[PDB]
Design a protein around this ligand. Structure first.
Ligand SMILES: CCCCCCCCCCCCCCCCCC(=O)OC[C@H](COP(=O)([O-])OCC(O)COP(=O)([O-])OC[C@@H](COC(=O)CCCCCCCCCCCCCCCCC)OC(=O)CCCCCCCCCCCCCCCCC)OC(=O)CCCCCCCCCCCCCCCCC
Ligand code: SF4
Lengths: 56, 215
């Protein structure tokens, strides 16, 4: 937050806590909006043998 | 069969007891044997029914090329019978019951031998290709499944498959076997089953060689 130090202390005293520790506006700490491709594994019934549907 | 018809007049003339005096019980008589493949002297010979396989081969075919220790596998009863390795052929008798006990079956008593210098996978794939080209296509299991197994074995020969496909091919053979109109499907599924059962390490090693060489 681009808040001056005097205003920082004033708001800290008014609320009675430390606010810069936990801010309610998102900043660079969030994840990127572009992400690498995933892989998404398969389920247990993706076998090539011993996988008859009558048993599941 | 031609042989069954041809032996009947002699059976009538000499009596059934004389013909039954040969071989074991439930396996009586004499048989015509065709030895081909990797023997010094491939030939057709008539011999007592329950003859040992090795004794037959050595006395009539002149032995296996390169010696008996050079033997790799034997197809005892034509392409429809599953193969057996040298250990089974050491003390196996050539009749219906003993060859069934070896999980093979006598079949037509056509002995095809293979030494250690030949590709067992390639020969089995050639047999499967023969069955693919000879199926009449009437019923879906034989037609589609045999085409499928032909493709799978063609991929197996090069090693282009993964090890998990061996059990898939076994299950495909199980699906074909016992579900067709005639026994051609069984006679195509059995060689694959025998090849898998007796040479799974060979297929796996071929696949891993392909995997390393292609990365
Ligand atoms: C009060 C007198 C004016 C100065 C003032 O208000 O400063 C408050 C300013 C408040 O800081 P903040 O808004 O908490 O911090 C955010 C940054 O300043 C964020 O700063 P910024 O980059 O948004 O600054 C933009 C800049 C330019 O802003 C503008 O031109 C638009 C606003 C015009 C308002 C007039 O702001 C100003 O120059 C005007 C300041 C107030 C003028 C009245 O700091 C102080 O002066 C505190 C003094 C003690 C107050 C008691
Ligand atoms: S199993 Fe026999 S009847 Fe069925 S498609 Fe094959 S050859 Fe024809």
């Amino acid at each position: 937050a681009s808040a001056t130090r005097v205003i920082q202390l004033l708001r800290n005293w008014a609320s009675g806590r430390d606010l810069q520790a936990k801010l309610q506006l998102r900043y660079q700490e969030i994840s990127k909006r572009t992400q690498p491709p995933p892989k998404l594994p398969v389920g247990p019934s993706h076998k090539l043998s011993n996988n008859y549907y009558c048993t599941r | 069969n031609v042989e069954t018809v041809a032996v009947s007049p002699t059976i009538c003339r000499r009596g059934g007891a004389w013909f039954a005096s040969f071989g074991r019980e439930r396996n009586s008589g004499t048989k015509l044997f065709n030895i081909s493949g990797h023997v010094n002297h491939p030939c057709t010979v008539e011999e007592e029914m329950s003859v040992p396989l090795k004794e037959l081969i050595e006395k009539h075919a002149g032995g296996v090329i390169g010696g008996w220790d050079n033997l790799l596998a034997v197809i005892p009863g034509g392409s429809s019978t599953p193969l057996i390795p040298k250990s089974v052929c050491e003390t196996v008798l050539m009749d219906f019951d003993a060859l069934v006990q070896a999980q093979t079956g006598l079949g037509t008593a056509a002995v095809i031998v293979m030494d250690r210098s030949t590709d067992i996978v390639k020969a089995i794939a050639r047999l499967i290709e023969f069955y693919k080209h000879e199926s009449c296509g009437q019923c879906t299991p034989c037609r589609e499944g045999v085409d499928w197994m032909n493709k799978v074995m063609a991929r197996f020969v090069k090693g282009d498959a993964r090890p998990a496909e061996i059990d898939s091919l076994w299950e495909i053979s199980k699906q074909i076997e016992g579900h067709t109109i005639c026994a051609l499907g069984d006679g195509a599924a059995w060689p694959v089953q025998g090849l898998i059962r007796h040479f799974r390490p060979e297929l796996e090693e071929r696949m891993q060689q392909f995997a390393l060489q292609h990365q």
